[PDB]
Amino acid sequence: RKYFVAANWKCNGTLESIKSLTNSFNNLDFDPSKLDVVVFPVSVHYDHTRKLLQSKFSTGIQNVSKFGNGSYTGEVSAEIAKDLNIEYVIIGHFERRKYFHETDEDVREKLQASLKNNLKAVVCFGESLEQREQNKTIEVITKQVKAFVDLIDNFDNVILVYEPLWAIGTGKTATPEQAQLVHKEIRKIVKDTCGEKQANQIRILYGGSVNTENCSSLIQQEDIDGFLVGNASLKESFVDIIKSAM
Amino acid sequence: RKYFVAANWKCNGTLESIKSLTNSFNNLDFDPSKLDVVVFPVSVHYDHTRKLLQSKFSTGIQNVSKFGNGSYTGEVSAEIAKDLNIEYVIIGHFERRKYFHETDEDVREKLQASLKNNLKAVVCFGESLEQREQNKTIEVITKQVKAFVDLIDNFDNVILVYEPLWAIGTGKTATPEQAQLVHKEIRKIVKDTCGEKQANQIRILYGGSVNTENCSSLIQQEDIDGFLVGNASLKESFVDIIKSAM
C-alpha cells in the first residue's frame, strides 16, 4: 500500500506566502506513482495554488457540503468540486466537529455525496482526553468508524486519519508506539466489517502533531501509512517530512 | 441613497454556466457610481467569476469566519479576504442560521471581524412564520438588529437585508406594502440608536422572493433600497431586475 502525505494549511496564507511556499515544494524530486502527496489550501486560494503547484502534487479542499447544489448559502457541494477537477476533500476534522458542531451523521452524508461524485475522501476521527482516561478509546473509535464504513466502495479512494485529541493541546504527548496500537486496532475493525483484502489496502494516516524530528519514527510503524500535517506544512521544511516517506 | 442590487448564487454553477451568465451580465450598460451591483459566487468560483465580470460589477463571498487566521479547518477569514481584495461578504443569511446554527452572537462577531479588515457587509435577518403569527415581528426584528448595530462604524459599508422567512417556502406571499411596513420600522430602530443622519444613509434591502414581475413594485417603496436576489440571479433575465433599480 502506497504512502500518503497531506498538508492541511487550514486557515492560513496570503498570495505571497503561497507563491513562496509552492516554489520550495516544486523543487522536490519525486515520482507521484509511488507516493501520494496532497495539499489542502483555503478554498479561495485553490485556483491560485493549483496553478503554482506542479502536477506531482494533488490538491483538495478542507471541507465539503453534506447537501448537493441548491439553496445553501456558503456551502461548496461535491458536484461543484467535481466540475473543477478537485480530487480530494477532508471530512470530519476535529476543528470542524468542535467549533462547528458536525456530527458523525454529517460525516457520513458528506462521505456519501463525495463518493457519489467520484471524489477521493480523507476522513478524520479520534477520541478526546476524557475518553482515553476512561479506557474508552476503542469504543469511541469503533462508533465513529461504524458511522460511515459501509459506504467505502473502493478502499484506495478513502483514506482514514486518526486524530489523537487527547494529545492535542492538552500538553500531553503521543509515542509512535501508542499510535501504532490504535492504527492496528482500526485496521482490525475494517477487516472484521469489510474483509481482509479491504483492510490491507486502505491507508490510515496519523493525524497528530507531526514535525521533521518525529516523522521518521511514525512512518516506520507498520500500520501508520503516512500523515495529515498541520502547522509543519506551512514551512519549507515540509519537504523533509515528505522525504521520510519515500 | 444609492440603490443596491445583489445576486446571491448560493451553491450553484459550473465553469461553463458561469462563463455564459457573466457574458450576458457584461452586456448591460449601467453606471456603478449611481448603482451598486454585487454578485456573490461560490468560494471556489470567486477568481473565475472576478476575471469574467467587468470591473463595473462588484464581487463578494457568501460567508466569513468569526475567527481570524489559525487552526480552523474549512473556514475563510476576513483577513484572507482582505489580501485578495474581496469587497463584500454576506453575514447572517437564514440558511446559515437554520442549517449551521449561526447565532446573533456569531453575526455580531463576523461583522466585527469584517469591519476591522475593511470589508463591506450585507447583514441578513428576519422573522419566521410562527413568530409572525404570534405578532412578534417587531420584537424579533428589533432584537436581531440590536445584536450588531452598535458596530456600524460607517453607514455606507454595511447593508441590511430583511428576509421574510414566513413567506419563504410556506405558500404565503409578502406584498410590497407589507415589506415597506417592516423596512420603515427597521430604519426607525437605526434612527433610535445611531442617529437620524445614519439611518437615512444606510441601505435596507428586501431579501424575499424577487423576480422580473415583482421587482419594480418593491424597489419603488420608500424604504426599500434594493434586493438580495436568490434564484432569479441564476438566469439571464437578471439584467431586467437590475434595470428596475436604474
From Swiss-Prot, chains A, B:
The gene is TPI. D-glyceraldehyde 3-phosphate binds at N8, K10, G169, L228, G230, N231. Catalyzes the interconversion of glyceraldehyde 3-phosphate and dihydroxyacetone phosphate in the glycolytic and gluconeogenic pathways. The active site is at H93 (electrophile), E163 (proton acceptor). The keyword Aminoacyl-tRNA synthetase does not apply. GO terms for cellular component: cytosol. CDD domains: TIM (cd00311). It is an enzyme of class 5 (isomerase). This is Triosephosphate isomerase. Changing F94S: 5.5-fold decrease in substrate affinity. 3-fold decrease in substrate affinity. It comes from Plasmodium falciparum.
